[PDB]
Design a binder for this molecule. Sequence first.
Ligand SMILES: [Cl-]
Ligand SMILES: [Cl-]
Ligand SMILES: [K+]
Ligand SMILES: [Mg+2]
Ligand SMILES: [Mg+2]
Ligand SMILES: [Mg+2]
Ligand SMILES: [Mg+2]
Ligand SMILES: [Mg+2]
Ligand SMILES: [Mg+2]
Ligand SMILES: [Mg+2]
Ligand SMILES: [Mg+2]
Ligand SMILES: [Mg+2]
Ligand SMILES: [Mg+2]
Ligand SMILES: [Mg+2]
Ligand SMILES: [Mg+2]
Ligand SMILES: [Mg+2]
Ligand SMILES: [Mg+2]
Ligand SMILES: [Mg+2]
Ligand SMILES: [Mg+2]
Ligand SMILES: [Mg+2]
Ligand SMILES: [Mg+2]
Ligand SMILES: [Mg+2]
Ligand SMILES: [Mg+2]
Ligand SMILES: [Mg+2]
Ligand code: NA
Ligand code: NA
Ligand code: NA
Ligand code: NA
Ligand code: NA
Ligand code: NA
Ligand code: NA
Ligand code: NA
Ligand code: NA
Ligand code: NA
Ligand code: NA
Ligand code: NA
Ligand code: NA
Ligand code: NA
Ligand code: NA
Ligand code: NA
Ligand code: NA
Ligand code: NA
Ligand SMILES: [Sr+2]
Ligand SMILES: [Sr+2]
Ligand SMILES: [Sr+2]
Ligand SMILES: [Sr+2]
Ligand SMILES: [Sr+2]
Ligand SMILES: [Sr+2]
Ligand SMILES: [Sr+2]
Ligand SMILES: [Sr+2]
Ligand SMILES: [Sr+2]
Ligand SMILES: [Sr+2]
Ligand SMILES: [Sr+2]
Ligand SMILES: [Sr+2]
Ligand SMILES: [Sr+2]
Ligand SMILES: [Sr+2]
Ligand SMILES: [Sr+2]
Ligand SMILES: [Sr+2]
Ligand SMILES: [Sr+2]
Ligand SMILES: [Sr+2]
Ligand SMILES: [Sr+2]
Ligand SMILES: [Sr+2]
Ligand SMILES: [Sr+2]
Ligand SMILES: [Sr+2]
Ligand SMILES: [Sr+2]
Ligand SMILES: [Sr+2]
Ligand SMILES: [Sr+2]
Ligand SMILES: [Sr+2]
Ligand SMILES: [Sr+2]
Ligand SMILES: [Sr+2]
Ligand SMILES: [Sr+2]
Ligand SMILES: [Sr+2]
Ligand SMILES: [Sr+2]
Ligand SMILES: [Sr+2]
Lengths: 132, 337, 53
Amino acid sequence: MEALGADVTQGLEKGSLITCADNTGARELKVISVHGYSGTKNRHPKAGLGDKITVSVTKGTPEMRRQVLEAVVVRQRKPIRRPDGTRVKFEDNAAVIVDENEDPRGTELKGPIAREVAQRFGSVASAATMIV
Amino acid sequence: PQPSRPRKGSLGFGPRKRSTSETPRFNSWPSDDGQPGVQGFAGYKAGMTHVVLVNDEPNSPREGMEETVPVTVIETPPMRAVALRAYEDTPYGQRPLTEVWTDEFHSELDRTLDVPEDHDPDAAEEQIRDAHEAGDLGDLRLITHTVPDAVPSVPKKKPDVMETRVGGGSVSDRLDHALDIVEDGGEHAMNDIFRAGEYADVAGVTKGKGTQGPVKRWGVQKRKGKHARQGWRRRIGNLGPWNPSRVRSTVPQQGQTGYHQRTELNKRLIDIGEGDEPTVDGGFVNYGEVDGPYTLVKGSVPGPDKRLVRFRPAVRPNDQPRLDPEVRYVSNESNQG
Amino acid sequence: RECDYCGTDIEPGTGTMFVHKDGATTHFCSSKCENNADLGREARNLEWTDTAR
RNA sequence: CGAGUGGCUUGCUACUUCGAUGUCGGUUCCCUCCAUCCUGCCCGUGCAGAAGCGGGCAAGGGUGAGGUUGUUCGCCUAUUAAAGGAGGUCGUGAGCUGGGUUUAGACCGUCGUGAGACAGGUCGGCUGCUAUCUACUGGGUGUGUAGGUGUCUGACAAGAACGACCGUAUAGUACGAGAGGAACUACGGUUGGUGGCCACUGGUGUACCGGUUGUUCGAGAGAGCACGUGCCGGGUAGCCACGCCACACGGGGUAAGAGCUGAACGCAUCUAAGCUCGAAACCCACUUGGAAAAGAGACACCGCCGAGGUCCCGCGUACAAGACGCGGUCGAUAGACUCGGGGUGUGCGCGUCGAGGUAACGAGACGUUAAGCCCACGAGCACUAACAGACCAA
RNA sequence: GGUCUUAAGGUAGCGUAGUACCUUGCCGCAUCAGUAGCGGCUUGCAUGAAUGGAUUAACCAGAGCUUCACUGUCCCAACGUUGGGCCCGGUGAACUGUACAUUCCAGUGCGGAGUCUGGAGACACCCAGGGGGAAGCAAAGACCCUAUGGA
RNA sequence: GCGAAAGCCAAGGCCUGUCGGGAGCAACCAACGUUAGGGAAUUCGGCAAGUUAGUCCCGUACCUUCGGAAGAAGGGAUGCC
RNA sequence: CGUGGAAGUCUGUUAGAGUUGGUGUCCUACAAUACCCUCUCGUGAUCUAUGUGUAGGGGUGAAAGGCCCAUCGAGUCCGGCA
Ligand SMILES: [Cl-]
Ligand SMILES: [Cl-]
Ligand SMILES: [K+]
Ligand SMILES: [Mg+2]
Ligand SMILES: [Mg+2]
Ligand SMILES: [Mg+2]
Ligand SMILES: [Mg+2]
Ligand SMILES: [Mg+2]
Ligand SMILES: [Mg+2]
Ligand SMILES: [Mg+2]
Ligand SMILES: [Mg+2]
Ligand SMILES: [Mg+2]
Ligand SMILES: [Mg+2]
Ligand SMILES: [Mg+2]
Ligand SMILES: [Mg+2]
Ligand SMILES: [Mg+2]
Ligand SMILES: [Mg+2]
Ligand SMILES: [Mg+2]
Ligand SMILES: [Mg+2]
Ligand SMILES: [Mg+2]
Ligand SMILES: [Mg+2]
Ligand SMILES: [Mg+2]
Ligand SMILES: [Mg+2]
Ligand SMILES: [Mg+2]
Ligand code: NA
Ligand code: NA
Ligand code: NA
Ligand code: NA
Ligand code: NA
Ligand code: NA
Ligand code: NA
Ligand code: NA
Ligand code: NA
Ligand code: NA
Ligand code: NA
Ligand code: NA
Ligand code: NA
Ligand code: NA
Ligand code: NA
Ligand code: NA
Ligand code: NA
Ligand code: NA
Ligand SMILES: [Sr+2]
Ligand SMILES: [Sr+2]
Ligand SMILES: [Sr+2]
Ligand SMILES: [Sr+2]
Ligand SMILES: [Sr+2]
Ligand SMILES: [Sr+2]
Ligand SMILES: [Sr+2]
Ligand SMILES: [Sr+2]
Ligand SMILES: [Sr+2]
Ligand SMILES: [Sr+2]
Ligand SMILES: [Sr+2]
Ligand SMILES: [Sr+2]
Ligand SMILES: [Sr+2]
Ligand SMILES: [Sr+2]
Ligand SMILES: [Sr+2]
Ligand SMILES: [Sr+2]
Ligand SMILES: [Sr+2]
Ligand SMILES: [Sr+2]
Ligand SMILES: [Sr+2]
Ligand SMILES: [Sr+2]
Ligand SMILES: [Sr+2]
Ligand SMILES: [Sr+2]
Ligand SMILES: [Sr+2]
Ligand SMILES: [Sr+2]
Ligand SMILES: [Sr+2]
Ligand SMILES: [Sr+2]
Ligand SMILES: [Sr+2]
Ligand SMILES: [Sr+2]
Ligand SMILES: [Sr+2]
Ligand SMILES: [Sr+2]
Ligand SMILES: [Sr+2]
Ligand SMILES: [Sr+2]
């Protein structure tokens, strides 16, 4: 994928619970896979900011729960690194449900987003309110 | 079926024993392309700081933008190519044919050497030329050495001697180039062979770790779950199968870790200089204050502060050289925060 | 730049930038002072900071 | 239908062990096989492209994470380039685990007159030993080659030191009616592996500084104990990963394959001689080790009555002993002193304010005081200690 | 089958159960995925009435499963603390020992060899290590059968 | 302090749960502390560890043999002068 | 609402009794059944000291074929016995 533009440290692993920052009706999300990731024997497949992860709807509306949907990790708690060494971390690790063509499934994106996510999923970017 | 997994640790750097000469000895020198020149220099690791540059990569979108980059400081004062060794080509590889020395030596070269009193340079030189005339002259290397005394941070005065190859020009031409350098005092600086922006090969003897277990040494797992309470924590599963009825030398075992020679490739020389420009507030921890001849080598460098590091024009470069990168900021910020 | 907490003239290539629930951006010159806000402490309240002295 | 190879299933035999070769599954760690799942190069097609289907060469590397079951097996999920199979006493219990089988207790079904049974189910139910030899990991002492120092050589040995993927441009182009939809090449990043390092982020930090609870030294100051820090906060040097740095191309020779010239056979033919090409595979390249390589090495210098080394003394870039490295007054090697660089957070005493209280008394605030206290770092500084001298040696 | 054996011929209930072979039964719940657990169905290989059946509040170091919370159980290891471990003085055993013994690779042999055959390798001694091998040591196998054995 | 509870300290007893010396003291083991992000992914099974925690107040479901369930759950409070 | 203070009642490392897990330490041991943490009971069918009774095909047994001096699906010693 198009170089993120920053060095991360996957704050999440498979089975990890994150918040679905948007208005899809999905509140809680469960990381299930990481698009383009092959680990190594005995390792929790690591999910990080700027990753297209496969996800499951933990908490949400009756129609949304139990759904296997794609998403883009928008926020995460573990720091990332920018070209000038400076680190950046978020009040919480969250993701935006994206679609087949990688465009958001909702319309509103709650809370901030990383200026690195923008590059890749610009359709998500041209929807982001705060872009840090 | 038991998932697959690459073996723990690499087998290339074996045996993992302590090094014989704390002074690195390259086992491969650059090809002869350009003008006659010595193929490497050396210095002493001082410490680490970062620096800000302007992206040189013509391919990166960051090209033109500032960028913070880490750098190891290495005091590289002038060395002295005290001699010239010639190699004759025999049916059993290269063998030292003869050497050519000098008069002007460093006041303290006798701390390690048995300095010459009666040498016959002109004659010895003849031997080399008659051998080249015969078509048996192999390669030309210059016995070299450092002036540890020049660096205050380094306690040692007793010079570190090491041979270095000379190449580039045609056998004849470089031969003379050698003698010329030597036929003075052999004094030369890092700028006499390098230029900021060039990728080099830094070799050094790693930091001393003493004996360590498999986990630390070969990166093997620790006992897990319930297996870490029965009286086994950093010990591996076993030393092999029933048969072969022996212990194969490829199983991770306790041993000497560290103090090994390593030749860290493609180290870009971020900046060559002289003065107190890279020194830190309070002084480079467990080293001291820098002031004078040196090099800012991008990234890490094998070895601890005060250890003799050796440079060499990259034998296997991957990218193209971006001479003299714009170094905007060099950190003077203290290393005790 | 400069620390959004204590007020030290921040060293380039050294630091941490923090976003919040709201979405603001408070920089930190060190985790030493970062962990002060975790203790409800303020830069002015704490004498030892460039703000309070 | 016929011909076989294998030794992974099962079965047959009863050669081997009954003065005992520890079970299944799992786990951890190393080596291997190819009947190749992926990756590379290829042939065919019901081969437009794209995505396939079948086949060849090929064992370099990879072949991951999870849900139920003790399971092996298998079923299922989501990722993937792919999530291949087998051997090593169905590798591995003087390694681990002990869930299943298979003791002694007990229940249910069945059978049994009964004790009790079960090639049924179920709950529970233990894991010894100080390593002589040998083996490999690392570390020393000697002898040999036959005075010393420094620098080399390179027979040999090891490596996967790299593997894979995505994205961009190529290009909405080739191709196709369309739908759909590439490549060469050059770029950026990711992943797995690898070696090294600590400027930065992160962890630790029972050095240290601070708050504070109980109790003891009358109070105050200041201190001990509360597990080997009472607890809470912060935490430098160091070590560290969760941090950071580096890890080719290209050559050479082949395989399968494409071909060239070419005869036996006037033609024809890639082959019989001969030749051009061609795999992630082989050699080289690169890294590592490596004078004990018995053909026991090379070069330079120094010295045989003195080169050099040991001892000793001060210490670490070294360290389980041994080893190693540096310094030893022609000195900054260690300590003290003083800066500097850092840690904590504003000292004791005193002054004022202080809800109140007749007063005594008063938690606290403030100023003095970015104070006091502290540092495993750096500098300056020969003040202290590197003194004294002993021995070996051609 | 619309009585026969042998007296009767399973009624309330409970039921894939600690009983159900088939079996990971079908359905639903639950999870990304559930041979697990619960509910329902149930012809019950081979449920069932004091050989007690069903029911159950409370009780339990009893068996199984789910959720919230927590976390070094794991991802994936790190640093630290105390006692050992290592060197020195002193004290000072035991297990084990047919012999020889520097081994490896194959082969061979009562078919599981340091010692045989052929090769390869190998200068001696010593320190620390983790235990691959001596089908390591420890117990005249508990398993199996046998004995004109025992209880 | 609820306490014959912990912790601390008397009176009293003892330094005889009777071998010492040295190495920032390595590997490895026993006890143990702290670990960012995630949070049972570990395993047969949360085994081990951890979480919770005293006292006061508000409040507390199903079911029940009316005894109980119940400290259910949940929420707030807590020092000093 | 108060008084009352019942119970094979509760919490409890009060004394005391027991012994779930770690399958931890130990396993030529401190110990021929031990150490540590956890855990259970703890006014009763309770715990305990001393004295006393039951003896081997016999006692005793809230029953495990448990226990009867490290000896129990039939104690121990000596004899039959070579
Ligand atoms: Cl293990
Ligand atoms: Cl996955
Ligand atoms: K046997
Ligand atoms: Mg596994
Ligand atoms: Mg630092
Ligand atoms: Mg800092
Ligand atoms: Mg055996
Ligand atoms: Mg093949
Ligand atoms: Mg292979
Ligand atoms: Mg079972
Ligand atoms: Mg086996
Ligand atoms: Mg074994
Ligand atoms: Mg065993
Ligand atoms: Mg069982
Ligand atoms: Mg019985
Ligand atoms: Mg043992
Ligand atoms: Mg059922
Ligand atoms: Mg027997
Ligand atoms: Mg029997
Ligand atoms: Mg009988
Ligand atoms: Mg954590
Ligand atoms: Mg698992
Ligand atoms: Mg537990
Ligand atoms: Mg009595
Ligand atoms: Na143990
Ligand atoms: Na075995
Ligand atoms: Na066969
Ligand atoms: Na096993
Ligand atoms: Na392969
Ligand atoms: Na499985
Ligand atoms: Na076996
Ligand atoms: Na086993
Ligand atoms: Na065992
Ligand atoms: Na090629
Ligand atoms: Na019946
Ligand atoms: Na009970
Ligand atoms: Na821990
Ligand atoms: Na062994
Ligand atoms: Na019997
Ligand atoms: Na009443
Ligand atoms: Na116990
Ligand atoms: Na009797
Ligand atoms: Sr060299
Ligand atoms: Sr070499
Ligand atoms: Sr154990
Ligand atoms: Sr064998
Ligand atoms: Sr293929
Ligand atoms: Sr099997
Ligand atoms: Sr099956
Ligand atoms: Sr296996
Ligand atoms: Sr079992
Ligand atoms: Sr059974
Ligand atoms: Sr001899
Ligand atoms: Sr493309
Ligand atoms: Sr289109
Ligand atoms: Sr203490
Ligand atoms: Sr051919
Ligand atoms: Sr030699
Ligand atoms: Sr009926
Ligand atoms: Sr041992
Ligand atoms: Sr006293
Ligand atoms: Sr004594
Ligand atoms: Sr701490
Ligand atoms: Sr579970
Ligand atoms: Sr699991
Ligand atoms: Sr509460
Ligand atoms: Sr009671
Ligand atoms: Sr158990
Ligand atoms: Sr113990
Ligand atoms: Sr025992
Ligand atoms: Sr424990
Ligand atoms: Sr109780
Ligand atoms: Sr009472
Ligand atoms: Sr007798």
